[PDB]
């Protein structure tokens, strides 16, 4: 299975100055639940913004840099390389990779952040006419999670 995994706001913002614009532990927990034991594929800028591979899953970084060789990270140099990765593969970001892969993936796990943030990077436009809502779950608001958010699982029609 090839999936997108993304959190975006009401205007599809996903980032600002190499960081996530919001702070939502519930979503981090969901990312961990979905991707532990599987594979994350991310562009070079997303990886660098994270800074280190995420524990307990395969980390794959897409880059043109032939010198890239980070411990605990597998490197690929082409989009076509993604299709040779075994198991459940999640396209993890950022804008460039989402743009390159949204027409190719089987399904999408999208956390919709119900707010409008300042952003400089965006998820590409998509239409529910192309995507079935397999599930939609409202996130719980509390002390640590204070922006409304909804977990979607969308499957390509
Ligand atoms: N909210 C979310 O769910 C979410 C998730 C992830 C990231 N983000 C945000 O997204 C932003 C970063 O996105 P971005 O678009 O700037 O960067 P990016 O997609 O993370 O990285 C782009 C880089 O990936 C490499 N790359 C992409 N396509 C390639 C290809 N076909 N062949 C070889 N290399 C390729 C290139 O690396 P080289 O230049 O080294 O060749 C390119 O410069 C950040 O703000 C981050 O916070 C948000
Ligand atoms: C966790 C945010 C997020 N949610 C969803 N649903 N899909 C995504 N693709 C990303 C993402 C991303 C990139 C990113 C992840 C993280 C991050 C932080 C913590 C954990 C974790 O606790 O496991 C995982 C990723 C940090 C910074 C960062 O870019 C700045």
mmCIF file of C-alpha atoms and ligand atoms in Angstrom:
data_model
loop_
_atom_site.group_PDB
_atom_site.id
_atom_site.type_symbol
_atom_site.label_atom_id
_atom_site.label_comp_id
_atom_site.label_asym_id
_atom_site.label_seq_id
_atom_site.Cartn_x
_atom_site.Cartn_y
_atom_site.Cartn_z
ATOM 1 C CA UNK A 1 0.000 0.000 0.000
ATOM 2 C CA UNK A 2 1.155 3.513 -0.881
ATOM 3 C CA UNK A 3 -0.421 6.187 1.344
ATOM 4 C CA UNK A 4 -0.135 9.912 1.946
ATOM 5 C CA UNK A 5 0.193 11.000 5.581
ATOM 6 C CA UNK A 6 -0.338 14.716 6.184
ATOM 7 C CA UNK A 7 -1.735 17.355 8.534
ATOM 8 C CA UNK A 8 -3.057 20.505 6.854
ATOM 9 C CA UNK A 9 -5.152 23.460 7.917
ATOM 10 C CA UNK A 10 -8.334 24.939 6.418
ATOM 11 C CA UNK A 11 -6.320 26.498 3.596
ATOM 12 C CA UNK A 12 -4.062 23.452 3.154
ATOM 13 C CA UNK A 13 -1.064 25.015 4.920
ATOM 14 C CA UNK A 14 1.345 22.276 6.066
ATOM 15 C CA UNK A 15 4.349 24.306 7.160
ATOM 16 C CA UNK A 16 6.016 27.613 7.902
ATOM 17 C CA UNK A 17 9.752 28.290 7.974
ATOM 18 C CA UNK A 18 10.634 24.600 8.104
ATOM 19 C CA UNK A 19 8.359 23.897 11.054
ATOM 20 C CA UNK A 20 4.832 22.691 11.747
ATOM 21 C CA UNK A 21 2.651 25.744 12.427
ATOM 22 C CA UNK A 22 0.638 24.062 15.209
ATOM 23 C CA UNK A 23 1.335 21.905 18.255
ATOM 24 C CA UNK A 24 -0.926 18.851 18.375
ATOM 25 C CA UNK A 25 0.247 15.846 20.416
ATOM 26 C CA UNK A 26 -2.863 13.856 19.387
ATOM 27 C CA UNK A 27 -1.668 14.022 15.788
ATOM 28 C CA UNK A 28 1.900 13.036 16.652
ATOM 29 C CA UNK A 29 0.420 10.020 18.459
ATOM 30 C CA UNK A 30 -1.618 9.101 15.401
ATOM 31 C CA UNK A 31 1.422 9.412 13.123
ATOM 32 C CA UNK A 32 3.271 7.051 15.474
ATOM 33 C CA UNK A 33 0.361 4.592 15.500
ATOM 34 C CA UNK A 34 0.003 4.572 11.715
ATOM 35 C CA UNK A 35 3.677 4.429 10.760
ATOM 36 C CA UNK A 36 5.458 2.404 13.466
ATOM 37 C CA UNK A 37 6.756 -0.786 11.865
ATOM 38 C CA UNK A 38 6.327 0.585 8.352
ATOM 39 C CA UNK A 39 8.054 3.081 6.040
ATOM 40 C CA UNK A 40 8.137 6.889 5.835
ATOM 41 C CA UNK A 41 9.328 8.546 2.625
ATOM 42 C CA UNK A 42 10.162 12.220 2.879
ATOM 43 C CA UNK A 43 11.903 14.933 0.887
ATOM 44 C CA UNK A 44 15.276 16.241 2.040
ATOM 45 C CA UNK A 45 13.972 19.496 3.513
ATOM 46 C CA UNK A 46 11.371 17.712 5.621
ATOM 47 C CA UNK A 47 14.000 15.345 6.947
ATOM 48 C CA UNK A 48 16.367 18.174 7.828
ATOM 49 C CA UNK A 49 13.594 20.049 9.572
ATOM 50 C CA UNK A 50 12.924 16.962 11.708
ATOM 51 C CA UNK A 51 16.641 16.504 12.250
ATOM 52 C CA UNK A 52 16.864 12.776 12.969
ATOM 53 C CA UNK A 53 15.135 9.590 11.823
ATOM 54 C CA UNK A 54 11.902 8.700 13.591
ATOM 55 C CA UNK A 55 12.304 5.628 15.839
ATOM 56 C CA UNK A 56 10.847 2.189 15.117
ATOM 57 C CA UNK A 57 10.145 2.561 11.421
ATOM 58 C CA UNK A 58 12.055 2.752 8.164
ATOM 59 C CA UNK A 59 13.114 6.310 7.246
ATOM 60 C CA UNK A 60 13.621 6.951 3.537
ATOM 61 C CA UNK A 61 14.829 10.341 2.288
ATOM 62 C CA UNK A 62 14.523 11.486 -1.310
ATOM 63 C CA UNK A 63 17.339 13.794 -2.431
ATOM 64 C CA UNK A 64 19.554 14.538 -5.431
ATOM 65 C CA UNK A 65 22.540 14.816 -3.060
ATOM 66 C CA UNK A 66 24.949 11.977 -3.868
ATOM 67 C CA UNK A 67 26.805 12.664 -0.593
ATOM 68 C CA UNK A 68 23.736 12.119 1.589
ATOM 69 C CA UNK A 69 24.359 9.213 3.962
ATOM 70 C CA UNK A 70 22.783 9.571 7.417
ATOM 71 C CA UNK A 71 22.828 6.774 9.997
ATOM 72 C CA UNK A 72 19.403 5.121 10.259
ATOM 73 C CA UNK A 73 18.228 6.621 6.990
ATOM 74 C CA UNK A 74 17.907 4.952 3.629
ATOM 75 C CA UNK A 75 18.444 7.296 0.694
ATOM 76 C CA UNK A 76 16.714 7.290 -2.662
ATOM 77 C CA UNK A 77 17.426 9.597 -5.617
ATOM 78 C CA UNK A 78 14.320 9.120 -7.763
ATOM 79 C CA UNK A 79 10.537 9.027 -7.423
ATOM 80 C CA UNK A 80 10.546 5.667 -9.207
ATOM 81 C CA UNK A 81 12.587 4.254 -6.322
ATOM 82 C CA UNK A 82 9.540 4.645 -4.073
ATOM 83 C CA UNK A 83 7.665 1.915 -5.923
ATOM 84 C CA UNK A 84 10.339 -0.653 -5.035
ATOM 85 C CA UNK A 85 10.007 -0.137 -1.305
ATOM 86 C CA UNK A 86 8.325 -3.150 0.347
ATOM 87 C CA UNK A 87 5.420 -3.027 2.784
ATOM 88 C CA UNK A 88 3.181 -0.135 3.764
ATOM 89 C CA UNK A 89 4.829 3.052 2.540
ATOM 90 C CA UNK A 90 3.674 6.482 3.754
ATOM 91 C CA UNK A 91 4.543 9.619 1.778
ATOM 92 C CA UNK A 92 5.304 11.943 4.698
ATOM 93 C CA UNK A 93 6.096 15.295 3.059
ATOM 94 C CA UNK A 94 6.779 17.945 2.191
ATOM 95 C CA UNK A 95 5.010 20.064 -0.419
ATOM 96 C CA UNK A 96 7.183 18.923 -3.298
ATOM 97 C CA UNK A 97 6.785 15.218 -2.571
ATOM 98 C CA UNK A 98 3.014 15.569 -1.961
ATOM 99 C CA UNK A 99 2.739 17.322 -5.324
ATOM 100 C CA UNK A 100 4.691 14.548 -7.000
ATOM 101 C CA UNK A 101 2.763 11.724 -5.368
ATOM 102 C CA UNK A 102 -0.873 12.775 -4.815
ATOM 103 C CA UNK A 103 -1.938 11.353 -8.192
ATOM 104 C CA UNK A 104 -0.156 8.046 -7.476
ATOM 105 C CA UNK A 105 -1.158 7.023 -3.965
ATOM 106 C CA UNK A 106 -3.846 4.486 -3.006
ATOM 107 C CA UNK A 107 -5.166 6.496 -0.118
ATOM 108 C CA UNK A 108 -4.550 9.408 2.219
ATOM 109 C CA UNK A 109 -4.509 9.838 5.977
ATOM 110 C CA UNK A 110 -5.241 13.520 6.486
ATOM 111 C CA UNK A 111 -5.509 15.420 9.750
ATOM 112 C CA UNK A 112 -7.543 18.545 8.995
ATOM 113 C CA UNK A 113 -6.526 21.323 11.396
ATOM 114 C CA UNK A 114 -9.643 23.484 11.694
ATOM 115 C CA UNK A 115 -7.817 26.821 11.778
ATOM 116 C CA UNK A 116 -6.086 29.310 9.478
ATOM 117 C CA UNK A 117 -2.339 29.555 10.032
ATOM 118 C CA UNK A 118 0.383 31.587 8.375
ATOM 119 C CA UNK A 119 2.143 29.210 5.992
ATOM 120 C CA UNK A 120 4.744 29.027 3.269
ATOM 121 C CA UNK A 121 4.188 25.437 2.203
ATOM 122 C CA UNK A 122 0.974 23.778 1.108
ATOM 123 C CA UNK A 123 -0.703 20.471 0.433
ATOM 124 C CA UNK A 124 -2.004 20.344 -3.161
ATOM 125 C CA UNK A 125 -5.699 21.013 -3.893
ATOM 126 C CA UNK A 126 -7.862 17.892 -4.012
ATOM 127 C CA UNK A 127 -11.583 17.204 -4.410
ATOM 128 C CA UNK A 128 -13.843 14.783 -2.510
ATOM 129 C CA UNK A 129 -15.355 13.895 -5.855
ATOM 130 C CA UNK A 130 -12.150 11.870 -6.327
ATOM 131 C CA UNK A 131 -11.936 10.498 -2.770
ATOM 132 C CA UNK A 132 -14.247 8.355 -0.625
ATOM 133 C CA UNK A 133 -14.328 9.098 3.105
ATOM 134 C CA UNK A 134 -13.455 5.735 4.624
ATOM 135 C CA UNK A 135 -13.498 7.293 8.090
ATOM 136 C CA UNK A 136 -13.731 10.716 9.743
ATOM 137 C CA UNK A 137 -12.959 11.080 13.445
ATOM 138 C CA UNK A 138 -13.004 14.317 15.434
ATOM 139 C CA UNK A 139 -9.961 14.761 17.621
ATOM 140 C CA UNK A 140 -10.472 15.330 21.331
ATOM 141 C CA UNK A 141 -9.759 18.814 22.606
ATOM 142 C CA UNK A 142 -8.019 19.154 25.962
ATOM 143 C CA UNK A 143 -5.150 20.723 27.889
ATOM 144 C CA UNK A 144 -2.465 19.729 25.384
ATOM 145 C CA UNK A 145 -4.596 19.674 22.215
ATOM 146 C CA UNK A 146 -6.382 22.941 21.797
ATOM 147 C CA UNK A 147 -7.050 23.375 18.078
ATOM 148 C CA UNK A 148 -9.983 21.437 16.606
ATOM 149 C CA UNK A 149 -8.854 18.742 14.229
ATOM 150 C CA UNK A 150 -10.347 15.832 12.329
ATOM 151 C CA UNK A 151 -8.698 12.584 11.288
ATOM 152 C CA UNK A 152 -9.650 11.528 7.758
ATOM 153 C CA UNK A 153 -8.901 8.352 5.894
ATOM 154 C CA UNK A 154 -9.614 8.951 2.189
ATOM 155 C CA UNK A 155 -9.516 6.242 -0.456
ATOM 156 C CA UNK A 156 -9.214 6.968 -4.172
ATOM 157 C CA UNK A 157 -12.518 6.267 -5.952
HETATM 158 N N1 LIG B 1 1.951 19.332 8.173
HETATM 159 C C1 LIG B 1 2.445 18.236 7.576
HETATM 160 O O1 LIG B 1 1.701 17.042 7.497
HETATM 161 C C2 LIG B 1 3.829 18.262 6.977
HETATM 162 C C3 LIG B 1 4.526 17.078 6.739
HETATM 163 C C4 LIG B 1 5.827 17.116 6.246
HETATM 164 C C5 LIG B 1 6.422 18.344 5.990
HETATM 165 N N2 LIG B 1 5.732 19.502 6.230
HETATM 166 C C6 LIG B 1 6.332 20.814 5.937
HETATM 167 O O2 LIG B 1 6.703 20.906 4.571
HETATM 168 C C7 LIG B 1 7.699 21.900 4.424
HETATM 169 C C8 LIG B 1 8.814 21.370 3.522
HETATM 170 O O3 LIG B 1 8.322 21.040 2.235
HETATM 171 P P1 LIG B 1 9.201 21.369 0.921
HETATM 172 O O4 LIG B 1 8.400 21.118 -0.294
HETATM 173 O O5 LIG B 1 9.862 22.676 1.143
HETATM 174 O O6 LIG B 1 10.355 20.261 0.986
HETATM 175 P P2 LIG B 1 10.488 18.665 0.874
HETATM 176 O O7 LIG B 1 9.449 18.119 -0.048
HETATM 177 O O8 LIG B 1 10.439 18.121 2.247
HETATM 178 O O9 LIG B 1 11.972 18.525 0.245
HETATM 179 C C9 LIG B 1 12.212 18.846 -1.112
HETATM 180 C C10 LIG B 1 13.515 18.174 -1.520
HETATM 181 O O10 LIG B 1 13.279 16.796 -1.725
HETATM 182 C C11 LIG B 1 14.106 16.293 -2.749
HETATM 183 N N3 LIG B 1 13.304 15.795 -3.872
HETATM 184 C C12 LIG B 1 11.969 16.015 -4.107
HETATM 185 N N4 LIG B 1 11.630 15.373 -5.252
HETATM 186 C C13 LIG B 1 12.734 14.760 -5.749
HETATM 187 C C14 LIG B 1 12.950 13.971 -6.871
HETATM 188 N N5 LIG B 1 11.957 13.706 -7.715
HETATM 189 N N6 LIG B 1 14.212 13.467 -7.122
HETATM 190 C C15 LIG B 1 15.244 13.743 -6.249
HETATM 191 N N7 LIG B 1 15.030 14.520 -5.130
HETATM 192 C C16 LIG B 1 13.790 15.019 -4.885
HETATM 193 C C17 LIG B 1 14.950 17.448 -3.237
HETATM 194 O O11 LIG B 1 16.101 17.385 -2.445
HETATM 195 P P3 LIG B 1 17.525 17.952 -2.964
HETATM 196 O O12 LIG B 1 17.375 19.438 -3.135
HETATM 197 O O13 LIG B 1 18.530 17.612 -1.893
HETATM 198 O O14 LIG B 1 17.853 17.297 -4.279
HETATM 199 C C18 LIG B 1 14.123 18.651 -2.835
HETATM 200 O O15 LIG B 1 14.904 19.807 -2.653
HETATM 201 C C19 LIG B 1 8.178 22.198 5.843
HETATM 202 O O16 LIG B 1 7.627 23.417 6.289
HETATM 203 C C20 LIG B 1 7.590 21.108 6.713
HETATM 204 O O17 LIG B 1 7.271 21.621 7.986
HETATM 205 C C21 LIG B 1 4.452 19.471 6.708
HETATM 206 C C1 LIG B 2 3.541 15.144 12.945
HETATM 207 C C2 LIG B 2 3.010 16.097 11.870
HETATM 208 C C3 LIG B 2 2.464 15.357 10.825
HETATM 209 N N1 LIG B 2 1.218 14.881 10.931
HETATM 210 C C4 LIG B 2 0.642 14.167 9.959
HETATM 211 N N2 LIG B 2 -0.606 13.724 10.109
HETATM 212 N N3 LIG B 2 1.325 13.890 8.836
HETATM 213 C C5 LIG B 2 2.583 14.339 8.681
HETATM 214 N N4 LIG B 2 3.286 14.103 7.574
HETATM 215 C C6 LIG B 2 3.192 15.090 9.677
HETATM 216 C C7 LIG B 2 4.570 15.604 9.545
HETATM 217 C C8 LIG B 2 5.704 16.049 9.497
HETATM 218 C C9 LIG B 2 7.107 16.627 9.478
HETATM 219 C C10 LIG B 2 7.549 16.793 10.792
HETATM 220 C C11 LIG B 2 7.339 15.791 11.733
HETATM 221 C C12 LIG B 2 7.792 15.965 13.040
HETATM 222 C C13 LIG B 2 7.574 14.971 13.983
HETATM 223 C C14 LIG B 2 7.687 15.281 15.331
HETATM 224 C C15 LIG B 2 7.458 14.293 16.279
HETATM 225 C C16 LIG B 2 7.120 13.006 15.879
HETATM 226 C C17 LIG B 2 6.887 12.033 16.841
HETATM 227 O O1 LIG B 2 6.662 12.378 18.024
HETATM 228 O O2 LIG B 2 6.881 10.822 16.523
HETATM 229 C C18 LIG B 2 7.003 12.697 14.529
HETATM 230 C C19 LIG B 2 7.229 13.688 13.580
HETATM 231 C C20 LIG B 2 8.438 17.133 13.415
HETATM 232 C C21 LIG B 2 8.653 18.137 12.479
HETATM 233 C C22 LIG B 2 8.208 17.956 11.176
HETATM 234 O O3 LIG B 2 8.386 18.894 10.209
HETATM 235 C C23 LIG B 2 8.799 20.129 10.814
#
